[PDB]
């Protein structure tokens, strides 16, 4: 038996425009990046760099 749960909420309108968000590793971690211009969805990269 499935019963839809229905919630009524206020309906304000808001300005809505995506802002770039960067992700950063926490202390103890680092992010490796693949720098190949021809990179596949998976597999090895020979040009690899480290970023925070």
């Amino acid at each position, epitope marked *: 038996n499935c019963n*839809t749960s*229905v919630i*009524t909420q*206020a*309906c304000p309108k808001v300005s809505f425009e995506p802002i770039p968000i960067h992700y950063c590793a926490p202390a103890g971690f680092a992010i490796l990046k693949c720098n190949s211009k021809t990179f596949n969805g998976s597999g090895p990269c020979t040009n690899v760099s480290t970023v925070q």
Partner: antibody
Amino acid sequence: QVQLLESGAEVKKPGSSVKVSCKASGDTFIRYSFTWVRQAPGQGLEWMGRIITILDVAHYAPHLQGRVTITADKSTSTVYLELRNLRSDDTAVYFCAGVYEGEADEGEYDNNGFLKHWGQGTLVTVT
Amino acid sequence: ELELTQSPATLSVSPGERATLSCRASESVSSDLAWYQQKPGQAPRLLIYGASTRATGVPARFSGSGSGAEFTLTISSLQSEDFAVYYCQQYNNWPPRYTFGQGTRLEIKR
């Protein structure tokens, strides 16, 4: 284009319950919303609630919800009102109304708060 | 919640008169107000919605306007045909706790 056909009159002993209904005709039931009102017997009107048929969702007036259920069965194009724990205070003419919505089927529902299509009125009293 | 007050309980009119039926809201609304005609034994026909827009089938005699909490329905060249109890309805609510005024009757004096 929307016809509303009300159910007949009824009388119930206080503490009991009544269920009344409206049949929609000439249009697609799921296409648009319906509401219920209570017309007091020689007094003004009370909004009772609203039912959305595209979403099976309903809202009620704040002093009625412990007693009122508004539902619908789209397969018979019928809107239903059920009241429990009745009092003589609830003697009134009850009825449906509808408002055409912008193609709810396509998800272009307006949620209009005013009503255009009105039923005849069904008197419910107590005994 | 919302409450609406009709200023006249009964408006003093005569045929050809300009009816002026005001309605005061307990709180502000912008366009989400409508007017209806309750004739004895009849359905409360919709006249005006959106504060000023007339519904299809409504005579040109019926018009109105308002903002905030102050709205008026007027009837140009009032006919005996228009002697309905007029109700003011306010719906700028979500959840939709919609409300009604007490109703104004028109009466021809004599």
